[PDB]
Design a protein around this ligand. Sequence first.
Ligand SMILES: Nc1ncnc2c1ncn2[C@@H]1O[C@H](COP(=O)(O)OP(=O)(O)OP(O)(O)=S)[C@@H](O)[C@H]1O
Ligand SMILES: Nc1ncnc2c1ncn2[C@@H]1O[C@H](COP(=O)(O)OP(=O)(O)OP(O)(O)=S)[C@@H](O)[C@H]1O
Ligand SMILES: Nc1ncnc2c1ncn2[C@@H]1O[C@H](COP(=O)(O)OP(=O)(O)OP(O)(O)=S)[C@@H](O)[C@H]1O
Ligand SMILES: [Mg+2]
Ligand SMILES: [Mg+2]
Ligand SMILES: [Mg+2]
Lengths: 87, 130, 65, 429, 428, 120, 58
Amino acid sequence: GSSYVAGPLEYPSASLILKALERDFWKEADLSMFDLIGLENKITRHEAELLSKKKIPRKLMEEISAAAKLKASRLFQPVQYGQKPEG
Amino acid sequence: SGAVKRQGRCDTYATEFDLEAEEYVPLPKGDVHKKKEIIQDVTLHDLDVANARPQGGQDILSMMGQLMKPKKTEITDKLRGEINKVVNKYIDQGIAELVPGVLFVDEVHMLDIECFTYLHRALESSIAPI
Amino acid sequence: LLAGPPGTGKTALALAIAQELGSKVPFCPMVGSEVYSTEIKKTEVLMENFRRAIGLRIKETKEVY
Amino acid sequence: TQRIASHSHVKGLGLDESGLAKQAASGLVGQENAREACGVIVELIKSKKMAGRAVLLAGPPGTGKTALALAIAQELGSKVPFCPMVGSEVYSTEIKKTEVLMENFRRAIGLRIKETKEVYEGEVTELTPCETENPKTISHVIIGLKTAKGTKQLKLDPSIFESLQKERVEAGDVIYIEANSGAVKRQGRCDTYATEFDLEAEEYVPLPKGDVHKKKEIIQDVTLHDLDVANARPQILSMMGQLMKPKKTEITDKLRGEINKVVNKYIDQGIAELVPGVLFVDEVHMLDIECFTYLHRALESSIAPIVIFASNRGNCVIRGTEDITSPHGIPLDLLDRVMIIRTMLYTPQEMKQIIKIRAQTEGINISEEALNHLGEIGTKTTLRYSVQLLTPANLLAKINGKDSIEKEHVEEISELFYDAKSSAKILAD
Amino acid sequence: VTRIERIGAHSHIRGLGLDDALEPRQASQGMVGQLAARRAAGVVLEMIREGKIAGRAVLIAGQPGTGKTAIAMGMAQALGPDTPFTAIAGSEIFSLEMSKTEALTQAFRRSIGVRIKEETEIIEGEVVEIQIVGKLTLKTTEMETIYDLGTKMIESLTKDKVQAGDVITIDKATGKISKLGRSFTRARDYDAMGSQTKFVQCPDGELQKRKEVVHTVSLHEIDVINSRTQGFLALFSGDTGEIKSEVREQINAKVAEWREEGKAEIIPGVLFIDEVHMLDIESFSFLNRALESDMAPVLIMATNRGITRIRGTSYQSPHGIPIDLLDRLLIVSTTPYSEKDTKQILRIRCEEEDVEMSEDAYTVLTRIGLETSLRYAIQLITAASLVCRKRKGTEVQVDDIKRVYSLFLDESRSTQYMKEYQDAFLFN
Amino acid sequence: LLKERLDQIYLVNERRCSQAPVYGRDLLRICALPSLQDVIDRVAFVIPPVVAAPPSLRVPRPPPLYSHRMRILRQGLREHAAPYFQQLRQTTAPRLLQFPELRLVQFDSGKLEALAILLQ
Amino acid sequence: FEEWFPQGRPPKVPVREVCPVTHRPALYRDPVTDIPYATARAFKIIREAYKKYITAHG
Ligand SMILES: Nc1ncnc2c1ncn2[C@@H]1O[C@H](COP(=O)(O)OP(=O)(O)OP(O)(O)=S)[C@@H](O)[C@H]1O
Ligand SMILES: Nc1ncnc2c1ncn2[C@@H]1O[C@H](COP(=O)(O)OP(=O)(O)OP(O)(O)=S)[C@@H](O)[C@H]1O
Ligand SMILES: Nc1ncnc2c1ncn2[C@@H]1O[C@H](COP(=O)(O)OP(=O)(O)OP(O)(O)=S)[C@@H](O)[C@H]1O
Ligand SMILES: [Mg+2]
Ligand SMILES: [Mg+2]
Ligand SMILES: [Mg+2]
């Protein structure tokens, strides 16, 4: 015993029906400035505070517009016991 | 935003093949760099429903969210408060302008006592329209 | 509240107000019976309609290459 | 805990060894007969013999019915599951009322699970296989484990070689091996090899303290409702289920019977011990006729908890009926299944004692004449009202730089705030 | 510029207008008269600030227009924004998404703030070099260091595509990487930039800083986050459904443990339910037990009904509230305004609405308010202001108030004219 | 014209850094709390009377944007399904066929029953 | 066999490095001179010393 299998009900329509709600990009603003929920997977409140604090001001933008493996003993003298290290 | 849209093939190549399933669009007429000051009008409800549910996400749960049955939901007072704050910030910056309008409720006799009793608080709010 | 008998121009006067305001100023028409959504509570319908009546004109310069 | 609620002073039924009620003890005053009957109910609960026994606390408003139920809860301790409900909660939008009732019945049956695990944990110090001639063949794999206490060598079955490489165990890894299954689990590099210069988080763990071989006892408290919910919907189908809203479901009796079978098997095996407890239904007159009728069948189950009802409605029409009045809003058929404990009105002296105990619990210094004035206010008005005056009068006193409430503070607060009867008087005029 | 918040019915109220001794001052912070009610509300505000006693309920009862909502707004303004003040209308609990008891439970738990402190150890710096074993070099304006990389750390660095010049934060407690942005330089300028690109200064101070952060949430938010895998979405959409009692009990116990450990603070707030007589007998019965908790907020209610039918029953009770719930609350009564209080309320509304009015205009408008209603006179303030502006005047005169009185009717005159033509209206 | 470019960069960057999330990741992280199969296969036999593929919306000149959006939707769904594809396939494919159980090949004739007895 | 059972020598206990400037438990190591240090002042002193030493050496 097996099911009947019908062909799909083809549904004709005009192309314009799918072009509805499509607005030209010269009338769409960057509404993402009001997007709130999208920030939950991106940033954090402390990270937001850091970003606000460390944003580059305009003046810095305008201004914008040897390794070797040494040893501590090689550079700095050891310190006698009971003495404050000074460098 | 860095968004890239490929709006077809140049019509100068319409004869590169005799039969291709492609969309030919003419070469742009103006300069390569285009500047336009524009305006768009939105309602606060549009921002509310935009932030009601994530959209445009490439993650599988967002793709299923695109697939699922669209339902109205009881948007929270907290989301509305946050949207009010953001709109206020951008009004201060100067890139948005509030345009308060009118809500017309014809045949208002059809509201029940509960709707009227809520409309007391709704009208007494400082964000309500006329 | 526009009050009076049937056919005394209440709806006509409201639409005249809408015409005098212009297209930029939002004008959300609704009927009292549209609160009985089967999906959301009546106060949510009213709040949605309250929010629709506040518009926000957002101004930007698009730059495109 | 720290914040003070309307019953935060109720510490239990003030009963002696003989079961008689003291005049004022454990935060309760008066209600001696009702407190003694509640004590007999506590003995019934602790006997664990009976199922579905019902008791109705009945009496005027503000006679301590809820206080007596929370006193039973204090007497039974935190081990016995005590499930508070109000009758308004049955009217859910996700599930039918009788399912809410059955779910709250199963919340009041506790089960205590006892797990005894034997584990060999330590930092890995050697993994030398023991070669042999077969009667390269290995007959054992020797693992050396180090803890702060000492070191032990284990002579494990050679088949554990698969799990060692699956877990990618190497020297310097903290691992644990369970005695029963013999499968190894790896839990990171020993932190003695961590430097401050390398960056990893999950892959380091401190060297275990204690002996290398450990016997752990794990005791978990669950309800039968917890088992019901767990077996009804275990946690790509999971992706869709977690994206969609996880509504309450009408759990079938089949699942409840299966879980009864599993719990009886655990109790036979000694792993678990049942702790049947109490379902408290306040404002039970908010239940409708369908709920009361269902409760007929629910209380006759051999699995049911002991249920405590409270009502104050007097001769009132039963919700969901028309014109069927009942002695408590509770149909006579259900009233035939409950033992009734009456609660009685307080004398002025008992009210003064309650007011004093409330002032003590709220941390309020009250003068003698202020106490007398507030008592007489409570003999007018209500007890609840006079108690509610304590903290605003204390605040008014603190404003005036007085460390104790004086009568003038009570008078002024009484002039500011009015009761239900005085407000009905204002409304009538 | 027109901000989102404009002149509403209570914009003029900026507190209860009380002194340190809670004595009600006439004409302070926008509040006029209602001395006894304002003093009682000040006592309630002190109770709310103290926080020690849970579930205290107060009913502000009085005639329509007697400033009940005004007193609620003054309490909300005087109470700091730090302490929650959840204001709903009685009709907000009738939802298709949840039972009345669930809506009341969520309203209660929105009104308790919990403030959770956390200390973290993070490494934040600018990426100098990355070498795939692996090595990473980070720097600040004061330091430079090089780290060795583990398997999961190099995997995270590759997957996030951390490139030299980025500013990243890596948390040692969890080993996760977050890219705060890329440092701007002369070689990194482009003709277009991606959406995710954010330019940022090189971090200051030491690389491995110790943080102290405090998050302010509410018990309802903790509930909703723990409702389901992506529960925090419901904090926007509101599709919370009915949260299970297990989750609420577990959260209550966890917050108790946090407070015992000193990690969290509990800030009990206020749930104002205006127009509370829309609740039904089931909602009132639920509230009778909801207020006996230690996590109950201070409950404030307002109604204007007299001896009216309780919703959901055929019984009549004062304020439409059963006497079971009235015994659990204190009642603050408002009083109808005098001529002086009416005139001073009108003056404060003129000052907020920015309307200049002649003294004769004040007299006539006060007589109108006494004869018809306070709200009608307040509405006529701005109506007459508009009419005066249309006349090219700068001060509202009696003729402008007469004009707007002739344009806009009140309840009494509209009802009388409706009765005159009652044959034409429907279903009298 | 570099001044205008710097102005554009600064404005966009200031807009992007200005907004904090409502809740954030750390908040959510810190607020988070810590047998019939044999009997089922013997009973799964109902086949649907009719099966049909979903209706196909037919248009001339399908829009480039609509087609591109559908293509990227399908690509994303198939990319996410690939690690779990056999699970999706087995947990969605319908039961269309119903063969008579081989036990009936004995049952249909008594000769085969007696032969079963004799051969056993 | 040797693939499945490698006889790995136990890892060496690390050097508990110390800052040569202040003698505190080392938290960092300078990428250029490969010398550990514990504070920003130590880093500044170390880099001044390194520049002086590289000038003296060549
Ligand atoms: N003053 C008017 N000038 C021109 N057309 C009018 C005027 N008043 C009413 N109409 C028209 O006559 C009809 C009257 O309908 P409405 O203006 O809707 O009256 P109404 O009071 O709204 O009736 P109800 O209460 O909605 S049944 C409409 O077609 C109007 O457009
Ligand atoms: N005997 C008592 N000793 C001490 N405190 C009491 C006593 N009786 C009542 N109380 C307290 O006084 C208040 C009134 O008692 P309740 O238990 O609330 O009365 P009730 O019988 O529950 O009233 P209803 O029927 O629910 S309106 C509560 O704060 C109790 O803790
Ligand atoms: N004492 C007052 N001081 C300042 N403004 C007041 C005062 N009393 C009333 N108002 C204002 O006058 C109006 C009174 O309306 P409400 O405050 O809503 O009165 P109400 O008691 O809430 O009456 P109901 O019950 O809501 S109909 C509002 O615009 C108030 O802001
Ligand atoms: Mg009309
Ligand atoms: Mg009670
Ligand atoms: Mg009001």
